[PDB]
Write a protein that binds this ligand. Structure first.
Ligand SMILES: CC(=O)N[C@H](C(=O)N1C[C@H](O)[C@@H](F)[C@H]1C(=O)NCc1ccc(-c2scnc2C)cc1)C(C)(C)C
Lengths: 141, 104, 87
């Protein structure tokens, strides 16, 4: 269902990383498989060639935490007006305090040791259930 | 520009925001609305420095880029009891425990 | 402006805008103007209040969003508080 369209109509795009994370751009190919592309360091930009109807999403390259692009989950390049590229502004979401705490706890505790933490079982489960693109694609469908 | 503050006295902490251009006296009116004490019974501080009523929060160094929503700047507060003002007393927050082994 | 008082296990009294406290469905239920938290110490509850300020300020805003900072030493206790408060 969620897949790029094979339009062959070029669309030039600027990926702008306005987050403090290393960004992994992910292209959804014609069968809907996620294809990872080169990462963007924090604060950096890249002018890239894409196509109309193509679907992109953006993740923290290290943790796969979710990021937003133009304030939403998916970015689809559109028709260029007057030869101008489309801007893909990549930003942190306002994570819930809970998800933000899970991020920090995950970065400090090796996964073998989640169970050793003195917290209710359901928080072990929340930590183990770390962000992943597959899961989100199932969600977004 | 908004500045984000914690106004602190003893074991009391008010979270609020104000304009950089607003005055110390105007902050006292804010505290008055919350703690029911008028400006003449209030002293505001930045650290140990007593703040002048007529000055802006900006002039007293509370700026949009230092007094942030996720890291607000602290304004000290003292009340007059009868004739004289109590000393500035701010109770520290509790201490975090030691990091568990598995977080080192 | 309407304010509510949130009281930490160690007696610190945090006074925040009512609107901000209602970020938490748990707090909304404890109110529906003071709530005592017997398990949340001040070094955790202060951060919770900072988060309310942060969330209200940066929700539906296009000004670049900074990272919400959480020191390692408080992260575990903040997690538990966040989970209790559903925020
Ligand atoms: C006609 C077509 O659809 N071609 C595809 C294509 O050219 N694509 C798919 C996406 O729309 C876009 F990725 C484009 C493409 O692969 N462009 C090359 C490209 C190279 C590096 C980068 C990035 S991302 C972060 N840094 C860089 C340098 C982005 C795009 C492909 C993969 C079948 C050859």
């Amino acid at each position: 269902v969620l897949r790029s369209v094979n339009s062959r109509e070029p669309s030039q795009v600027i990926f702008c990383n306005r987050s403090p994370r290393v960004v992994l751009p992910v292209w959804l190919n014609f069968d809907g498989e996620p294809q990872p592309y080169p990462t963007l360091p924090p604060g950096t930009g890249r002018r890239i060639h894409s196509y109309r109807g193509h679907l992109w999403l953006f993740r923290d390259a290290g943790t796969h935490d979710g990021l937003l692009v133009n304030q939403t989950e998916l970015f689809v390049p559109s028709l260029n007006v007057d030869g101008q590229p489309i801007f893909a502004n990549i930003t942190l979401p306002v994570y819930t305090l809970k998800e933000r705490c899970l991020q920090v706890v995950r970065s400090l505790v090796k996964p073998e040791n989640y169970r050793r933490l003195d917290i209710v079982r359901s928080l072990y489960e929340d930590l183990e259930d770390h962000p992943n693109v597959q899961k989100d694609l199932e969600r977004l469908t | 520009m908004d500045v984000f503050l914690m106004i602190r006295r003893h074991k009391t902490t008010i979270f609020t925001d104000a304009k950089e251009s607003s005055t110390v006296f105007e902050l006292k009116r804010i505290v008055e609305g919350i703690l029911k004490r008028p400006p003449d019974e209030q002293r505001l501080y930045k650290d140990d420095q007593l703040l002048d009523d007529g000055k802006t929060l900006g002039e007293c160094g509370f700026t949009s880029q230092t007094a942030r929503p996720q890291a607000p700047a602290t304004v000290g507060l003292a009340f007059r009891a009868d004739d004289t003002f109590e000393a500035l007393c701010i109770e520290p927050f509790s201490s975090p425990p030691e990091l568990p082994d598995v977080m080192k | 402006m309407m304010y509510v008082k949130l009281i930490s296990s160690d007696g610190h009294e945090f006074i925040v805008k009512r609107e901000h406290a209602l970020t938490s469905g748990t707090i909304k239920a404890m109110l529906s103007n003071e709530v005592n938290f017997r398990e949340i110490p001040s070094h955790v509850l202060s951060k919770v209040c900072m988060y309310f300020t942060y969330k209200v300020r940066y929700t539906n805003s296009s000004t670049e969003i900074p990272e919400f900072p959480i020191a390692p030493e408080i992260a575990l206790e903040l997690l538990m508080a966040a989970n209790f408060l559903d925020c």
